[PDB]
Amino acid sequence: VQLVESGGGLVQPGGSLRLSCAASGFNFSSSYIHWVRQAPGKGLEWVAYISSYSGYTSYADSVKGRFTISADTSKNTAYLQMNSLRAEDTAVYYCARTPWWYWSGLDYWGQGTLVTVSSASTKGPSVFPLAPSSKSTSGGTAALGCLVKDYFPEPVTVSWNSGALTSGVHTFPAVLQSSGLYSLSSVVTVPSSSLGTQTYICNVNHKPSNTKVDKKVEPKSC
Amino acid sequence: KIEEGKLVIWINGDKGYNGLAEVGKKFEKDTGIKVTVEHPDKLEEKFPQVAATGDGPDIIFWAHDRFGGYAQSGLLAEITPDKAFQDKLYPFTWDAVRYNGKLIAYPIAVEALSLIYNKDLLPNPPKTWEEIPALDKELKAKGKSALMFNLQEPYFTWPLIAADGKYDIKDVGVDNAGAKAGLTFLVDLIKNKHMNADTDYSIAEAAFNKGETAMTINGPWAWSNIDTSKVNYGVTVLPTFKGQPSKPFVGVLSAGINAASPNKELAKEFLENYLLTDEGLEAVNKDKPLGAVALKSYEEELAKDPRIAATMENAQKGEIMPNIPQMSAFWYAVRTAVINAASGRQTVDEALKDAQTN
Amino acid sequence: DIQMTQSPSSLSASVGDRVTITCRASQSVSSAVAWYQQKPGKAPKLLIYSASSLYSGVPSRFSGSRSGTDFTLTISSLQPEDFATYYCQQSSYIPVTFGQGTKVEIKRTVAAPSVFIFPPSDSQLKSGTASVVCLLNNFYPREAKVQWKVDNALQSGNSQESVTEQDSKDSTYSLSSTLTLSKADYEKHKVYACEVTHQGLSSPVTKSFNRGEC
Ligand SMILES: OC[C@H]1O[C@H](O[C@H]2[C@H](O)[C@@H](O)[C@@H](O)O[C@@H]2CO)[C@H](O)[C@@H](O)[C@@H]1O
Q: Ligand 1: list residues with CB < 6 Å.
A: B 12, 14, 44, 63, 65-66, 111, 153-155, 219, 251, 331
Are β-strands A57-59 and A44-51 bridged in parallel, bridged antiparallel, or unpaired? Answer: antiparallel
Give the number of other Cβ atoms within 10 Å of residue A2's Cβ.
12
DSSP string, chain A: -EEEEE--EEE-TT--EEEEEEEESS-GGG-EEEEEEE-TTS-EEEEEEEETTT--EEE-TTTTTTEEEEEEGGGTEEEEEE-S--GGG-EEEEEEEE-SSTT----EE---EEEEE-SPPPBPPEEEEEPPPTT--TTSEEEEEEEEEEEBSS--EEEEGGGTB-TTEEEPPPEE-TTS-EEEEEEEEEEGGGTTT---EEEEEEGGGTEEEEEE--PPP-
Whether A26 contacts B319, CB under 8 Å: no
Burial A157-184 (b: 16+ CB within 10 A, else e): ebbbeeeebeeeebbbbbbeeeeebbbb
Q: How many Å lie between the alpha carbon of A18 and the closest alpha carbon of chain B?
A: 24
CA distance B89 to B106: 10
Q: Looking at ligand 1, which atom is closest to the CA of residue B66?
A: 21
* Partners of B257 in the β-ladder: B59
| Cα–Cα separations (whole angstroms), residue B167 to A26, A29, A91, B164, B350 | 19, 17, 43, 15, 13
Give the number of other Cβ atoms within 10 Å of residue C153's Cβ.
10
What is the CA(B348)–ligand 1 centre distance, in A?
23
One fold for B5-111+251-322 and B112-250+323-358? yes
Out of 1.10.630.10, 3.40.190.10, 3.50.50.60, 3.40.50.1370, the CATH code matching B5-111+251-322 is: 3.40.190.10
CA distance B296 to B277: 10
What is the CA(B324)–ligand 1 centre distance, in A?
15
CA distance B54 to B261: 8
DSSP string, B135-161: HHHHHHTTT-EEE----SSHHHHHHHH
Whether C86 contacts C35, CB under 8 Å: yes
| Cα–Cα separations (whole angstroms), residue A109 to B91, C42, C63 | 21, 10, 21
Whether A120 contacts A90, CB under 8 Å: no
Length of chain B: 358
Domains of chain C, earliest start first: 1-108 (2.60.40.10), 109-214 (2.60.40.10)
Cβ–Cβ below 8 Å for C32 and B303 = no
SS3 (DSSP) at B220: helix
Q: Find the helix packing angle between B176-191 and B154-161, rounded to 10°.
A: 120
What dihedral angle (degrees, nearest 10) is formed by the CA atoms of A34, A35, A38, A44? -20
* Partners of A129 in the β-ladder: A146
Domains of chain A, earliest start first: 1-119 (2.60.40.10), 120-222 (2.60.40.10)
Question: Comparing C-alpha atoms, which of B19, B54, B22, B51 is closest to residue B35?
Answer: B22
Resolution in A: 2.1
**Cross-chain CB nearest to A149 (options C34, C45, C131):** C131
Question: Comparing C-alpha atoms, which of A93, A86, A103, A105 is closest to residue A35?
Answer: A93
Interface of A with C in 36-55 (CB under 8 A): 36, 43-46, 49
CA distance A111 to A95: 8
Q: Find the helix packing angle between B348-356 and B327-342, rounded to 10°.
A: 160
The separation between the first and the last C-alpha atoms of chain C, rounded to the nearest angstrom, is: 62
Give backbone dihedrals phi and psi of C125, rounded to 5 degrees, phi first: -65, -45
Torsion over CA: B13, B16, B20, B25 (sign): positive
Cis, peptide link before residue B306, omega less than 30° from 0 = no
Whether A116 contacts A9, CB under 8 Å: yes
Method: X-ray
Question: Comparing C-alpha atoms, which of A112, A158, A96 is closest to residue A8?
Answer: A112
Helix, strand, coil proportions of chain B in percent (round to 5)? 45, 20, 35
Residues of C in contact with A128 (CB under 8 A): 120-121, 123-124, 131
Whether B154 contacts B335, CB under 8 Å: yes
Q: How many Å lie between the alpha carbon of A101 and the closest alpha carbon of chain B?
A: 7
Residues of B in contact with C32 (CB under 8 A): 90, 296
Q: How many Å lie between the alpha carbon of B90 and the closest alpha carbon of chain C?
A: 6
| Cα–Cα separations (whole angstroms), residue B127 to A140, B158, B237 | 60, 18, 8
Give backbone dihedrals phi and psi of A94, rounded to 5 degrees, phi first: -105, 135
Question: Comparing C-alpha atoms, which of B172, A183, B131, A192 is closest to residue C176?
Answer: A183
Give the number of other Cβ atoms within 10 Å of residue B154's Cβ.
21
What is the CA(B2)–ligand 1 centre distance, in A?
26
Task: Say yes or no: domain B112-250+323-358 is CATH 3.40.30.10.
Answer: no
Distance of CA C62 to the CA centre of its chain: 22
- What is chain A's alpha carbon radius of gyration, rounded to the nearest angstrom? 22
Length of chain A: 222
Give backbone dihedrals phi and psi of C29, rounded to 5 degrees, phi first: -85, 170
* Partners of C115 in the β-ladder: C136
User: For a substitution probing ligand 1, which of B153, B330, B335 has the most ligand atoms within 8 Å of its CB?
Assistant: B153
**Cα–Cα–Cα angle for B110, B113, B114, rounded to 5 degrees:** 120
Whether B111 contacts B221, CB under 8 Å: yes
Helix, strand, coil proportions of chain C in percent (round to 5)? 5, 50, 45
Please state the domain extents for chain B.
5-111+251-322, 112-250+323-358
Whether C89 contacts C4, CB under 8 Å: yes
